[PDB]
RNA sequence: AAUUCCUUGUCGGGUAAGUUCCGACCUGCACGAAUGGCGUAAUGAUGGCCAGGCUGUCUCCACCCGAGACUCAGUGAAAU
RNA sequence: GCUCGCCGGAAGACCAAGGGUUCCUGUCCAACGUUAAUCGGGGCAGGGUGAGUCGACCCCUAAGGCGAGGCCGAAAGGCGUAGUCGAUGGGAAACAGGUUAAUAUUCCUGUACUUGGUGUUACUGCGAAGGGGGGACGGAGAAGGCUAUGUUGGCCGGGCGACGGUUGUCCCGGUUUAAGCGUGUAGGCUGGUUUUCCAGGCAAAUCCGGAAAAUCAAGGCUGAGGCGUGAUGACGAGGCACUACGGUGCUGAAGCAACAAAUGCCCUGCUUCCAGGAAAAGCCUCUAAGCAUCAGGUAACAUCAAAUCGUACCCCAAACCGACACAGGUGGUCAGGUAGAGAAUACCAAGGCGCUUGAGAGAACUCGGGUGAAGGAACUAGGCAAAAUGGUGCCGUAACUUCGGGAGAAGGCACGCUGAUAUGUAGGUGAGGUCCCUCGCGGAUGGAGCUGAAAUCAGUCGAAGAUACCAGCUGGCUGCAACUGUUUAUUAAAAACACAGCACUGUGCAAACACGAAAGUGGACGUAUACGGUGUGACGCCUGCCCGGUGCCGGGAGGUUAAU
RNA sequence: AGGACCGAACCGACUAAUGUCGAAAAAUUAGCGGAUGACUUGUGGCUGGGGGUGAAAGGCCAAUCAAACCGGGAGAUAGCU
């Protein structure tokens, strides 16, 4: 649900919250937790490799099952939980044998639902099937690119891909970016689309909302000096230069895709 | 006025102590230069 | 009998411009 | 105009008197629509102007209370 | 020694960090102390630091470091696995009183507790770098139950008094006692027990998890305080006897109740919110290999061990950081009385101090302050600085607006003391007695006692009753930026920067991109509702025309065009 | 509930005065801003000089920063004093 707060005071005026009543109001499953120390954008050398990253509230990593290797074992959905790491919510799944796992929650998933994995599975949302068994023209999420890898495509909230073509041992996928990718058939995918589709409606409201979300202030190149940035300098907001990255690479319409290795799996580019 | 020098025995030893100097070769060269000069206090220590 | 070590920066002069 | 050389542009408001300020006109030296344009409640140790209250800011200072200055004893510098 | 003054959420009392004998006693005054000096944190000598329980060490781990092999690199060396280090965190145990010129939660007295080794006795299957449980966790907010602590009354001891009154509802002092053990309460959490089965817990499992039924509605866990014991002990005003006249020794009454009440405890609780809030070991429990006349384990008793290092003193300062015995800086704990909402402010207790040059005089002038005739910004770049406003309750409150605001708008009225309503009310707390009782730290009735607003009326004092301290100046028009926030440590705190939002663009994940000769890391244990870059900067109405030039993207006839 | 309001501790440093061989190599006194948050603080780590870090001032990096400090090339060079 989307609720807009009353303009009680500045900073709360523009906040738009996304309240999810069916979320679990309690501590998560301790056995599946794992510490996640923040890096602040620093790498092993200790230098800032990625800017505008730092701070934020402490958050624990949840071991989410992406491979879904428990084939032929029906499992019930215990509840849904808030995972700070993903944009989408996660679901606690209890298998018939009595083990609990975390999975991405699609739109149609809710407590008390039944899910299954492997070829011997129905077509209900949330089931894990290989594309060869999935009918063409359907919506799937958490797609794999190589068998057993785990799934990398369509993992964010409200994301999905289409089965557009089936060329024998290969399948063509149309991604939310308008990209048509050729993928090997045997590797797995999950039916339905990721839940929490209203992630756009949130606006964070104020400056500090981004601050405790792990994001640091961004400094425009113009405000910088000539030495530290290619932009900057001059009296009175002078630019007179083509936009560029801080390291001289020309941005704003310069393709940086140079792989020559995965191009054989690319059918069409973005448009 | 918080001056620059804020003493701390632990940090002083872990930054300029004997074991810190010997860990890396350059510190080893520093000890060698001190010995050649014949300084009474080779390094910092209690 | 140590000669003065720290000499402060001179007071800025009056602008004769 | 935070932009206007000419210039204290012209008219009105405010003052006994207004190169600032507010409103209008437009001969925009050289505003202008994301190096954003025009508005905008709230906010500001922010810029400019006006009124009430208030007073030594001032007309014009006067007196008083303390610490120095001054004298005595002791110690005893500095720039040049 | 007698007075005066100052601090009293500190200028008091205890610690860490950091100093390293500055501690105490004797002795000395050259130098040191901004003066003198018999004095000292100065010189010389002697003395002083006592731990199974405090801390370190030790067991475990975070960030991070190092790193066997390994990967990479002209060499040096870089990165990193198994590992091993790393408290700012987790893990066994002590309190009260007394004593030294100087140490004590360490010594002494009294009374306790914990972890191991060995032996004995009675039972028993034990057994891991392996599994599970536990350890184990956020912010904000509220209420209840308590304590530290304080006030008052009672009780005990003393006093009745140099200027009037004071045997009285008078005045002063005291009315203190822990850890541990027992009982276990208010509160909080969870439905218990039995049996069967199960590809999960990388092997196994009587454990965890899951699925089944039978049976009962109850147990279990956690838990401050209180009450007992500890303790007919200690402490204790005061009095007495000797003083190298500093003190020593002896004796020692009462030691209760009520009320108020925390920022402390119950509470790692509870209720809520999104930003979703360490790890590992000790500990509990189940098994593998292996051992089962053993070993090993459990319970009881006895005995032994608990080493080693720190322990003085300063610690908001004369002892640390500032070259100084420097108007500066420095984390944590305790923190009383009256007034007050308050850790503000004022005055005080405990306690500690008068800041290491003084004595005179009472000129200009400078500094920090007080007051002021009449005028009231005429000063000045400019109401700069000063003056003024200042609290509580009630009444009242504009334009504008994003409907929240603006707003404490503006502007008015009442504030002391005494009496009465009411020999202190409403309220709060609540004894004895009485009635029940799944019988006790229980439930009802009951109101003694104690505490205690606000309001009304009446009277009365003063020039002034928010009487001191404390404690907004207000309103109108307009520029800029939406706002909180950030910045030129040390002349610029702004219109600058950031900002939520918006748009463009790159990126299909071995992502783009960045740091690296490389390996490898970050991005991200993320993957297009995501990430990087760039510009703009809430919100409202919008964001027009131009592709020549310079960039970028796509195309390809022809020309030109390196190495070879 | 709140990057909410008034206001101490705490953090900051807007105005004025004093102080410039000062008590202090940016302080004191009287007012002032934030004060549940983009807050503040202790301890210990990481980033090393053509680099770091920077809510961006060429600011900060041991009282020094339009390229730190120390040693060396080095008795650099100086048509200049």
Q: Which chains touch B (3 or more CB pairs under 8 A)?
A: none
Domain harbouring A219, CATH code: 4.10.950.10
Residue A56 shares a structural domain with residue A126? no
User: Sign of dihedral through CA atoms A103, A105, A111, A117?
Assistant: negative
Burial (CB < 10 A; 0-12, 13-18, 19+), residue A72, is exposed
Q: In sequence order, what are the beta bridge partners of A90?
A: A81, A104
Residue A104 shares a structural domain with residue A131? no
Q: Which residue has the tokens 């918080």?
A: B2
Q: Is A259 helix (H, G, I), strand (E, B) or coil?
A: coil
The phi, psi pair for A183, rounded to 5°, reads -130, 150
Q: Which two tokens stand for residue A234?
A: 């001059």
Q: Is A210 helix (H, G, I), strand (E, B) or coil?
A: helix
Residue A8 shares a structural domain with residue A81? yes
Residue ending a domain, among A194, A225, A252, is A194
Distance from C-alpha of A205 to C-alpha of A3, rounded to nearest angstrom: 13
Residue A235 shares a structural domain with residue A256? yes
Q: Could you tell me the distance in Å between the CA of residue B2 and the C1' of nucleotide E106?
A: 38
Residue ending a domain, among A136, A161, A194, is A194
CB A250 within 8 A of CB A167: no
The CA-atom distances, in angstroms, between B35 and each of A127, A260, B28 are: 74, 59, 11
Question: How many structural domains are present in chain A?
Answer: 3
Q: Could you tell me the distance in Å between the CA of residue A108 and the C1' of nucleotide E269?
A: 38
Residues 179-238 on chain A lying near strand D, CB distance under 7 A: 222, 237-238
Residue A76 shares a structural domain with residue A9? yes
Distance from C-alpha of C8 to C-alpha of C17, rounded to nearest angstrom: 25
DSSP run (H or E) holding B28: helix B25-37
Distance from C-alpha of A221 to C-alpha of A224, rounded to nearest angstrom: 5
Q: Is B23 helix (H, G, I), strand (E, B) or coil?
A: helix
Residue A35 shares a structural domain with residue A89? yes
CB B37 within 8 A of CB B5: no
Residue A185 shares a structural domain with residue A205? no
Distance from C-alpha of A151 to C-alpha of A131, rounded to nearest angstrom: 13
Experimental method: cryo-EM
Q: How many CB atoms lie within 10 A of CB A77?
A: 19
A73 touches strand E (CB under 7 A): yes
Domain that holds residue A136: 117-194
Q: Which two tokens stand for residue C13?
A: 């002069």
CA torsion A212→A176→A111→A132, rounded to 10°? -140
Residue A264 shares a structural domain with residue A213? yes
Q: Which two tokens stand for residue C11?
A: 């007071």
Distance from C-alpha of A95 to C-alpha of A92, rounded to nearest angstrom: 10
Distance from C-alpha of A111 to C-alpha of A126, rounded to nearest angstrom: 12
Residues with Cβ < 8 Å from A10, sequence gap 6 or more? A206
Q: Which two tokens stand for residue A230?
A: 């290619």
Domain harbouring A99, CATH code: 2.40.50.140
Residue A96 shares a structural domain with residue A136? no
Domain ranges of chain B: 1-46
DSSP codes of every residue in A107-148 = TT--TT-EE-BSSS---STT-EEETTTSPTT-EEESB-SSTT
Q: Could you tell me the distance in Å between the CA of residue A54 and the C1' of nucleotide F27?
A: 37
Q: Which two tokens stand for residue A95?
A: 């298998």
Q: In sequence order, what are the beta bridge partners of A173?
A: A163, A181
Q: Which two tokens stand for residue A153?
A: 């495509």
Q: Which two tokens stand for residue A43?
A: 């790498």
Residue A10 shares a structural domain with residue A109? yes
Residue A17 shares a structural domain with residue A88? yes
CATH of B1-46, one of 3.60.15.10, 3.40.47.10, 3.65.10.10, 1.10.287.3980: 1.10.287.3980
Q: Which of A208, A237, A236 is nearest to A220 (CA)?
A: A237
CB A229 within 8 A of CB A221: yes
Q: Which nucleotides of D are covered by protein (CB under 7 A)?
A: 35-36, 41-42
Q: Which two tokens stand for residue A101?
A: 């796992």
Q: Which two tokens stand for residue A57?
A: 């509230």
Reported resolution, Å: 2.6
CB A116 within 8 A of CB A109: no
Q: Which nucleotides of F are covered by protein (CB under 7 A)?
A: 1-4, 21, 24-27, 37-39, 43-48, 52-58, 62-63, 67
The phi, psi pair for A39, rounded to 5°, reads -105, -25
CB B44 within 8 A of CB B17: yes
DSSP codes of every residue in A131-200 = TTTSPTT-EEESB-SSTTS---BS-STT--EEEEEEETTEEEEE-TTS-EEEEESSSEEEES-BS-GGGT
């Amino acid at each position: 649900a989307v609720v807009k707060c009353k303009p009680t005071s500045p900073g709360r005026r523009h906040v738009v919250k996304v309240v999810n009543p069916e979320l679990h109001k309690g501590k998560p499953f301790a056995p599946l937790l794992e510490k996640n120390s923040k890096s602040g954008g620093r790498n092993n050398n200790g230098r800032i490799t990625t800017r505008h990253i730092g701070g934020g509230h402490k958050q624990a990593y949840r071991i989410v099952d992406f491979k879904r290797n428990k084939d032929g074992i029906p499992a019930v959905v215990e509840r849904l939980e808030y995972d700070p790491n993903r944009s989408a919510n996660i679901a606690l799944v209890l298998y018939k044998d009595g083990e609990r796992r975390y999975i991405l929650a699609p739109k149609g998933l809710k407590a008390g639902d039944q899910i299954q994995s492997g070829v011997d599975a129905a077509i209900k949302p949330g089931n894990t099937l290989p594309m060869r068994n999935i009918p063409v023209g359907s919506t799937v999420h958490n797609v794999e690119m190589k068998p057993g890898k785990g799934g990398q495509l369509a993992r964010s909230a409200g994301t999905y891909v289409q089965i557009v073509a089936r060329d024998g041992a290969y399948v063509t996928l149309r991604l939310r970016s308008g990209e048509m990718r050729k993928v090997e058939a045997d590797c797995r995918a999950t039916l339905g689309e990721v839940g929490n589709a209203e992630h756009m409606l949130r606006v964070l409201g104020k400056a500090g909302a981004a601050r405790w979300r792990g994001v640091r202030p961004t400094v425009r190149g113009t405000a910088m000096n000539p030495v530290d940035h290619p932009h900057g300098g001059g009296e009175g907001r002078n630019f007179g230069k083509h936009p560029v990255t801080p390291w001289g690479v020309q941005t704003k319409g310069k393709k940086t895709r140079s792989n020559k290795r995965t191009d054989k799996f690319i059918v069409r580019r973005r448009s | 006025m918080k001056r620059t020098f804020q003493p701390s025995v632990l940090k002083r030893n872990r930054s300029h102590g004997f074991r810190a100097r010997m860990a890396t070769k350059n510190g080893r060269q520093v000890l060698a230069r001190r010995r050649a000069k014949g300084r009474a206090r080779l390094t910092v220590s209690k | 009998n140590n000669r003065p070590v720290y000499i402060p920066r001179p007071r800025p002069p009056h602008p004769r411009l």
